Amino acid sequence: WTATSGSCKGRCFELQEVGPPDCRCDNLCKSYSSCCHDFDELCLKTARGWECTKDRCGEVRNEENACHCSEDCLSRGDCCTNYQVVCKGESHWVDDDCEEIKVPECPAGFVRPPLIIFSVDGFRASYMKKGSKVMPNIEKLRSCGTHAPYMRPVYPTKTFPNLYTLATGLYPESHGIVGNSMYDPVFDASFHLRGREKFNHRWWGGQPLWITATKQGVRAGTFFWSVSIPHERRILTILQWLSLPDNERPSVYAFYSEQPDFSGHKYGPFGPEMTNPLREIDKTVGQLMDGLKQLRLHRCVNVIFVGDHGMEDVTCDRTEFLSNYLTNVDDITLVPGTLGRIRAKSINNSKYDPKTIIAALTCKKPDQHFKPYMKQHLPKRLHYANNRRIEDIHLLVDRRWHVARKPLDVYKKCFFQGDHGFDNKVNSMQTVFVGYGPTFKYRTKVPPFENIELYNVMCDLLGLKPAPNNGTHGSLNHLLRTNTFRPTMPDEVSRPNYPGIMYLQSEFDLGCTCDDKVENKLEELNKRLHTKGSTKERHLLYGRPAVLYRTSYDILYHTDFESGYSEIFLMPLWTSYTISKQAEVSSIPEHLTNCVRPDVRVSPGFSQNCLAYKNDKQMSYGFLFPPYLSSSPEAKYDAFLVTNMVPMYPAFKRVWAYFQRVLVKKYASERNGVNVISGPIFDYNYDGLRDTEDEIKQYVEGSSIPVPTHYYSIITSCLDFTQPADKCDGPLSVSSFILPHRPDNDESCNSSEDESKWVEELMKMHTARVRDIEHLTGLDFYRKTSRSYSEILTLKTYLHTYESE
Ligand SMILES: O=C(c1cc(OCC2CC2)c2ccccc2c1)N1C[C@@H]2[C@H](C1)[C@H]1CN(C(=O)c3ccc4[nH]nnc4c3)C[C@@H]21
Ligand SMILES: *[C@@H]1O[C@H](CO)[C@@H](O[C@@H]2O[C@H](CO)[C@@H](O)[C@H](O)[C@H]2NC(C)=O)[C@H](O)[C@H]1NC(C)=O
Ligand SMILES: [Ca+2]
Ligand SMILES: [Cl-]
Ligand code: NA
Ligand code: NA
Ligand SMILES: [Zn+2]
């Protein structure tokens, strides 16, 4: 109940929201149907419009107006945004030349530049260039401030997941809003857009910027606006708040626009109907900067023009229906649209088997436009699994398509022409970022970056300490004039051992063999220096990775590669080697196909054995440094050490071999040498973090050799490719993958064909950031370069997406 029999006189758009039975006057009260009886009268005045005219100048203050052009309207803080243009001969902000803001120019009593977040729903990144002629104010923000060509949203590219990610810096699996629609089995509650359950706080995890601000003594305007409140009224309310007394005045504000998302759904991303919404948004920005100019706040506020996601072309006729794939389609609940999430309809159905459902959806139609996944098998770059609200079964939908349950769900719910939600690396889902103010840089373009990074920056601009989030704090310092946060490198926690020759061949009883006994001092001191590290500078280009947890591991040096070998996991954590453009691929000689060699530096007890692989009919093995890439016949025998060996399903060896035999050399010659760091990953609880020894769920049968869930590689080279990867002066270039270690290739529908037709497409799908691998390995890379650490942080968040323009 709400007693609407109170008043809002003086309380219009109050900042401290009251609770029932007191009627509300806050910018959200209509969404609760809770406002006082006179809220519309007193707070949403519409009389005479939103602009001044000449004949209104110097008028007699008539309080019924939506805004005022009376001579006293400034001291009251409530002029129309164009008042000083019409009445005082001044200029619109957009008509003023671009002028560098070298220092904040704030009025007295402003303790810091305020931050205004101007968020636009569905603002596809390409709008910045394609719509530039009809958005003059935004183009001035973009070109004078700091901008990226696009900003990568989080998956799913949906409204609530991305708005809350912006506000928290957290992947949706951590902050809990993993769709616009969710079922939580622990609550037995549902989150929808229709209803009041979404207003309950048990859904919203982490700590958003407004809580973070408040907890640290910075006041925040209330970020959310009920739909009915006109944009003009939101802008003015923000301006009014900026005129409050110093002790009352918030320091961070938000504006939200439903456009161009709303129209982009009806008319598609580039419908002719889309010019006008882009014009209007720009007008809204124009009113804000005009109103800031009237407040002498236009070279003092920091403004973030930011989108939540893009918009793709989608029509009802491009819909895949599960009724054509399954028989008993009523035994499942499907969350539909641009992604699919399947669970059982009834919790008391023992005939429900997710395996038969995944199988009935796998490569069934020749060109089918979605692909089923168990969520732990999703590309680790999406980080979309570690939450009970994410159903076990997931459908990744090709851009431009939908997935539905039965046809009747599409025609009893054509209509729309735009949608979003797809994979967050799709070009159409990319959105915008622009920063403008004294704390941003001037006329500076910065590379694309992920929106999980912004929360740390907004904390910087506001002087706040960020709650723990998934940003990499300092990877965006190159957007800032000042307030850059200077991080130190994490300290190494385990130091390695450097073992020498300590065991004899006969101490090993591993079941391996090698046709190698067909073995000079003119080059025997040569191979001694190799095993002590004489060539480590060629293959460990950016220093060894630091182990950020407590474990026992050895550094092993070889002519062609160095490893960091773990006695706890009986395999390297990392293996590092450089391949120049000149390097030649070689075969595995016929006599060495089944060669595996004891490593006289590592005890038998801390070594894999070959019998375990003979006995496990499902498991085979591979090598981290590839034998194909040896530098000489004599070096090749090092690639066959038991300490270079890792467990691999035969189906994954198809993939892994083609990467080592073909792609590494292809990349060496395209990029003028590459340095490659490879290794295993264990993520059996799909939380994106390195498993501990007691969390392994699978071993090579009859052994303590743990089976990785993934294999990674980090391919580095010189950004200026006219310098070899091993003689690089300047910035670096990187790509990486986290490949799922799976016993089939069902993810790849074309895997019955030659590896040249499918393997690299799979690797592209599972591209990763270096940062992602660090979470999964406890390793810290790039510890010793010539570059600045901030630059190195940006590199580690770099993601290579293989998208066009
Ligand atoms: O008022 C805020 C708001 C603003 C925020 O941050 C704005 C600030 C950053 C600048 C938030 C931040 C974190 C959490 C919630 C937030 C809510 N909304 C009001 C609308 C929108 C955001 C929510 C989703 N929605 C839709 O009607 C809708 C729109 C497009 C769609 N497409 N497909 N389905 C769709 C459904 C109803 C709610
Ligand atoms: C993303 O950031 C969050 C916050 O640091 C991480 O989540 C925390 O993880 C630890 C370990 O599981 C828990 O004790 C905390 O309760 C978690 N907090 C939240 C809010 O989830 C999360 O692990 C990070 N993800 C990645 C991939 O690094
Ligand atoms: Ca884990
Ligand atoms: Cl959704
Ligand atoms: Na075998
Ligand atoms: Na296949
Ligand atoms: Zn939308």
Curated annotation (Swiss-Prot):
Region described as Required for secretion: spans on this chain: 773-794
EC number: 3.1.4.39, 3.1.4.4
Positions glycosylated per UniProt: 3, 348, 360, 470, 750
Main localisation: secreted
Post-translational modification: N-glycosylation, but not furin-cleavage, plays a critical role on secretion and on lysoPLD activity. The interdomain disulfide bond between Cys-363 and Cys-749 is essential for catalytic activity.
A single BP term in Gene Ontology: sphingolipid catabolic process
Top-rank taxon: Eukaryota
Tissue: Abundantly expressed in cerebrum and cerebellum. Localized in secretory epithelial cells in the brain and the eye including choroid plexus epithelial cells, ciliary epithelial cells, iris pigment epithelial cells, and retinal pigment cells.
UniProt keywords, alphabetically: Calcium, Chemotaxis, Cleavage on pair of basic residues, Disulfide bond, Glycoprotein, Hydrolase, Lipid degradation, Lipid metabolism, Metal-binding, Obesity, Repeat, Secreted, Signal, Zinc
PROSITE patterns noted in UniProt: SMB_1, SMB_2
Annotated segments matching region Nuclease-like domain: 541-805
Cystines in this chain: 8-25, 12-43, 23-36, 29-35, 52-69, 57-87, 67-80, 73-79, 98-144, 106-300, 316-414, 363-749, 512-610, 514-595, 718-728
Annotated phenotype, changing residue 261 to N: Abolishes lysophospholipase D activity
Active site residues according to the UniProt entry: 159
Enzymatic class: hydrolase
The keyword Repeat belongs to this UniProt entry's keyword annotation: yes
Residue(s) at site: Essential for catalytic activity: 796
Binding site for Ca(2+): 683, 685, 687, 689, 691
Binding site for Zn(2+) 2: 261, 265, 420
Motif (Cell attachment site): 76-78
GO MF entry, a single one: scavenger receptor activity
SMB domain: residues covered: 4-47, 48-92
Protein name: Autotaxin
Organism for this UniProt entry: Rattus norvegicus
